[PDB]
Design a protein around this motif. Structure first.
Motif, PDB file in Angstrom:
ATOM      1  N   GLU G  49       0.869  -1.176   0.000  1.00  0.00           N
ATOM      2  CA  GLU G  49       0.000   0.000   0.000  1.00  0.00           C
ATOM      3  C   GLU G  49       0.907   1.226   0.000  1.00  0.00           C
ATOM      4  O   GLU G  49       1.213   1.789   1.054  1.00  0.00           O
ATOM      5  N   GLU G  51       1.588   5.114  -1.241  1.00  0.00           N
ATOM      6  CA  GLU G  51       0.745   6.260  -1.525  1.00  0.00           C
ATOM      7  C   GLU G  51       1.344   7.144  -2.605  1.00  0.00           C
ATOM      8  O   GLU G  51       2.557   7.158  -2.832  1.00  0.00           O
ATOM      9  N   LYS G  55      -3.302  10.153  -1.548  1.00  0.00           N
ATOM     10  CA  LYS G  55      -4.088   8.936  -1.633  1.00  0.00           C
ATOM     11  C   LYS G  55      -3.139   7.754  -1.742  1.00  0.00           C
ATOM     12  O   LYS G  55      -2.008   7.894  -2.216  1.00  0.00           O
ATOM     13  N   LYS G  56      -3.616   6.585  -1.340  1.00  0.00           N
ATOM     14  CA  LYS G  56      -2.809   5.381  -1.421  1.00  0.00           C
ATOM     15  C   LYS G  56      -3.102   4.621  -2.705  1.00  0.00           C
ATOM     16  O   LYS G  56      -4.170   4.756  -3.305  1.00  0.00           O
ATOM     17  N   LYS G  88      -8.493   4.454  -2.215  1.00  0.00           N
ATOM     18  CA  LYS G  88      -7.204   3.817  -2.452  1.00  0.00           C
ATOM     19  C   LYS G  88      -7.335   2.872  -3.637  1.00  0.00           C
ATOM     20  O   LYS G  88      -7.997   1.833  -3.537  1.00  0.00           O
TER      21      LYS G  88
END
Lengths: 150, 100, 84, 50, 129, 155, 194
Positions: G49, G51, G55-56, G88
């Motif tokens: 994950e 970013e 935002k990821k 995400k």
RNA sequence: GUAUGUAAGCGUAUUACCGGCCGGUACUAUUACUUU
């Protein structure tokens, strides 16, 4: 280009960019793996095996649905015979030379054309001699032109 | 005869069974387990006669191969002559319904 | 212009008549079509320059015209220029 | 004698060299449905009542 | 037959500015050739060059600013040590002032004065001015 | 190869069947003192338990390998315990700074432990004493010997 | 009460919590009543994950023997997970077993004698098709910038252009975060008759 | 502020061990070419 010829001419297929489409084809690589077991067992050459799948079903390219080349698809179910296909057309074309020129001689235009496919064997067969697809001590003999194809 | 009829034999050699000689042909002609019989034009005349009288009773079909024994004997992967042959089992080939 | 600055972005329609081979990428003019012969109903996909006699399993009306170019069927065809 | 050195391959020991896969994929196509019996037995028990 | 894929790519660049072709359609995208066009841009000889890749070979588009005179090629790749690089200047260049022969040694592809500082002997591919 | 076929008898000189009286029992599993070259080259296992005699063998004769060491290819092997190898190199001209395909040919001797060497196998070579009028080398190791195309494969 | 991993994360790795938190989200993606004949054995190996500043972008490590069946489910994998893991962006990314020869004095290859699908082209070619999965790539062009730098032109005519075009800004990030090549994505509306 | 021509970290046999990042030792498909 065009080795035995005066022409510069160029004629071939044209492959597209991508390597997966037809994705809309519900046909897999597995029923065509049976189709080569179904059709290719009837003695057909690796070229014309690849031409019946194009027109009929029609898969655009079996190289996109399956990774192996089609001789390996012959081999992996056991359909590679003793003789490679393309010289097997040439030697049949060579044996028609010793059917027309056995009686109807003086055709020195036709008798020119023996020197092509004898050379178009001997340069070509020297390549397949190396690639271990038929062993050395394979010498094309003149009487063998009947029985190699028949 | 034609080149195309020769190709019909060309898949029998990979697949189908064989009878070579008078004796091997006329043996299965007695049991009738053969289907197609081949006659080359240089067959001796009573031998050119005698085979086909069985076919009037064995209900089989023959052909007049327009080549010679030297080519028909080499049209089947061998090198010795062929004057008669009966293919007792069409393995994969298409002489099962094809006329010439 | 013979001394043009843009070769990456040519005009589209002249590239459509350029060649099957000499374009900026490689793709032929040929495609696949889904012919329904008008005396029957069955769906069949076929190449443009098929170079091969095709009939259906039970619907052998016309389905093709033998030629060296594309299969030019007059009033005996119904298909589309579309991947199926 | 040199012709038959590594020749446990030809007739039976093709598949008795391909038996490494014949004992895996044949059974385990069903055992995952047997592994997922928490939403297989309780799945058809819900559709039979509802 | 496409004998040397290097040199044929070079000459059509020289066969552009004479009739003033500011652009070049070019083939066939070899990575030894991609190690070479930026050397022109490393001294600003041409314009922008870009490479589409078909899945046979790839092909190159080359824009040109018009500052070149001639790019050249010695053939084939003669082996040249350090102590004898200066022989290939005076026979190939107009003067010691400008211009650049380009060889490649075991460290990579470079200028000759770059190689005159890197000090590793190698093989000539071409030259330009 | 040999069942001691000779009009005289052949034996590796310097050993004797000493039967009962001995310092201990030094059987050594065969009465054959197989030496080694020790120049990094491994000994062939067949040389230690060999029945061949071969007074001119580098492993088992009165030989110590000397000189330099090189590689190459072999062409002919008809003659007894002796093969015909071939080496390649270049030459530097003055007029062009260009090269050529010339070659020499040195005939060499084999112990039978490298039995069945053929055309065109790949064989390394090392020097020794003169044998008979030409032979000052000896075969070291069947190193590669692989033609993956035409020579080294069954059919 | 809240089952997580050990159904899908073998045979990969048990770290980490962000790879574990989607595994509790994976078991509630089993309740879609249509994918439950498939995802009972569709396994994962790892996740990531990373970013884009604010935002990821979620990386999903598919092990790829199931990429023939990972593709037809992938329309529904991204959509229901995006409304559960907003904002995400998610995309399956199969990290490969890269077989190198190390940059040393011709350092020794063996073992793993390097079939040709396992070279540095897989850092691009085996990676680029999985990033823009439903795009149906038509053309890659290599723009060469001034100081030895590069741009690549990725072409998609109309093949589901109206669902992933809001991710091409996200696609520019993670390709430079996984491979390093600077990328732009090519729109053109013209159905170029071939 | 800037530049990049510098080394390390970081997309990985950046080799195994004992030593104070740092010595010794386990320990490597070739040529042609070029380096000293």
């Amino acid at each position: 280009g065009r080795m035995h010829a005066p022409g510069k001419g160029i004629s071939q297929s044209a492959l597209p960019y991508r390597r997966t489409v037809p994705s809309w084809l519900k046909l897999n690589a597995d029923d065509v793996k049976e189709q080569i077991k179904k059709l290719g067992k009837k003695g057909l050459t690796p070229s014309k095996i690849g031409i019946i799948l194009r027109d009929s079903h029609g898969v655009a390219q079996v190289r996109f649905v399956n990774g192996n080349k089609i001789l390996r698809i012959m081999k992996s179910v056991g359909l590679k015979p003793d003789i490679p296909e393309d010289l097997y057309h040439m030697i049949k074309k060579a044996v028609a030379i010793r059917k027309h020129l056995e009686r109807n001689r003086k055709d020195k235009d036709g008798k020119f054309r023996l020197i092509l496919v004898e050379s178009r064997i001997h340069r070509l067969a020297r390549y397949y001699k190396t690639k271990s697809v038929l062993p050395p001590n394979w010498k094309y003999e003149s009487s063998t032109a009947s029985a190699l194809v028949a | 005869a034609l080149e195309s009829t020769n190709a019909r034999l060309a898949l029998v050699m990979k697949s189908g069974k064989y009878c070579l000689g008078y004796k091997q042909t006329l043996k299965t002609l007695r049991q009738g387990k053969a289907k197609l019989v081949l006659i080359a034009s240089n067959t001796p005349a009573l031998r050119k006669s005698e085979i086909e009288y069985y076919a009037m009773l064995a209900k089989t079909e023959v052909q007049h191969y327009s080549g010679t024994n030297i080519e028909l004997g080499t049209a089947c992967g061998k090198y010795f002559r062929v004057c008669t042959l009966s293919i007792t089992d069409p393995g994969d080939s298409d002489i099962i319904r094809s006329l010439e | 212009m013979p001394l043009a600055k843009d070769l990456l972005h040519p005009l589209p329609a002249e590239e459509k008549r350029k060649h099957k081979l000499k374009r900026l990428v490689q793709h032929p003019n040929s495609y696949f079509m889904d012919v329904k012969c008008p005396g029957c109903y069955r769906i069949t996909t076929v190449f443009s320059h098929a170079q091969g006699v095709v009939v259906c399993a039970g619907c052998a009306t016309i389905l093709c015209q033998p030629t060296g170019g594309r299969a030019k069927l007059t009033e005996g065809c119904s298909f589309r220029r579309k991947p199926q | 004698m040199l012709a038959d050195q590594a020749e446990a391959r030809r007739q039976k020991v093709r598949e008795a060299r391909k038996r490494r896969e014949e004992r895996i994929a044949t059974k385990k196509q069903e055992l995952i449905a047997l592994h997922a019996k928490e939403d297989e037995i309780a799945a058809k028990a819900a559709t039979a009542g509802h | 037959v496409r004998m040397n894929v290097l040199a044929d790519a070079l000459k059509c660049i020289n066969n552009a500015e004479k009739r003033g072709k500011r652009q070049v359609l070019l083939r066939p995208c070899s990575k030894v050739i991609i190690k070479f066009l930026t050397v022109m841009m490393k001294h600003g000889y041409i314009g922008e060059f870009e490479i589409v890749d078909d899945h046979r070979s790839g092909k190159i588009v080359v824009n040109l600013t018009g500052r070149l005179n001639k790019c050249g090629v010695i053939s084939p790749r003669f082996d040249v040590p350090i102590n004898d690089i200066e022989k290939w200047t005076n026979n190939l260049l107009p003067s010691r002032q400008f211009g650049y022969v380009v060889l490649t040694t075991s460290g990579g592809i470079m200028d000759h004065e770059e190689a005159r500082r890197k000090h590793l002997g190698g093989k000539i591919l071409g030259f330009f001015f | 190869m040999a069942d001691q076929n000779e009009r005289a008898f052949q034996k590796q000189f310097g050993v004797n069947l000493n039967r009962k009286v001995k310092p201990g029992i030094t059987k050594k599993k065969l009465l054959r003192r197989s030496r080694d070259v020790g120049l990094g080259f491994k000994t062939p296992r067949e040389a230690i338990d060999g029945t061949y005699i071969d007074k001119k063998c580098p492993w088992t004769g009165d030989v110590r390998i000397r000189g330099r060491i090189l590689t190459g290819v072999v062409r002919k092997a008809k003659m007894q315990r002796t093969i015909v190898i071939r080496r390649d190199y270049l030459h530097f001209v003055r007029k062009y700074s260009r090269f050529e395909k010339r070659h020499r040919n040195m005939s060499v001797h084999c112990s039978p432990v490298f039995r069945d060497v053929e055309h065109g196998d790949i064989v390394t070579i090392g020097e020794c004493r003169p044998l008979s009028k030409t032979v000052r080398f000896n075969v070291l190791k069947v190193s590669k010997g692989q033609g993956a195309k035409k020579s080294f494969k069954k059919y | 009460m809240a089952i997580g991993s050990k159904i899908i994360k073998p045979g990969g790795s048990d770290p980490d919590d962000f790879e574990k938190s989607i595994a509790q989200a994976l078991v509630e993606l089993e309740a879609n009543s249509d994918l439950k004949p498939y995802l009972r054995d569709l396994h994962i190996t790892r996740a990531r994950e990373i970013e884009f500043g604010s935002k990821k972008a979620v990386i999903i490590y598919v092990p790829i023997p199931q990429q023939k069946v990972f593709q037809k489910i992938q329309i529904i994998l991204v959509r229901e997970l995006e409304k559960k893991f907003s904002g995400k962006h998610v995309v399956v990314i199969a990290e490969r077993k890269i077989l190198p020869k190390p940059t040393r004095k011709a350092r020794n290859p063996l073992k793993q004698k390097r079939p040709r699908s396992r070279t540095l082209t897989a850092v691009y070619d085996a990676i680029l098709e999985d990033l823009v999965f439903p795009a149906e790539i038509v053309g890659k062009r290599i723009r060469v910038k001034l100081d030895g730098s590069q741009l690549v032109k990725v072409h998609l005519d109309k093949n589901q252009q109206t669902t992933i075009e809001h991710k091409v800004d996200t696609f520019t990030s993670v390709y430079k975060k996984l491979t390093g090549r600077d990328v732009t994505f090519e729109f053109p509306d013209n159905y170029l008759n071939v």
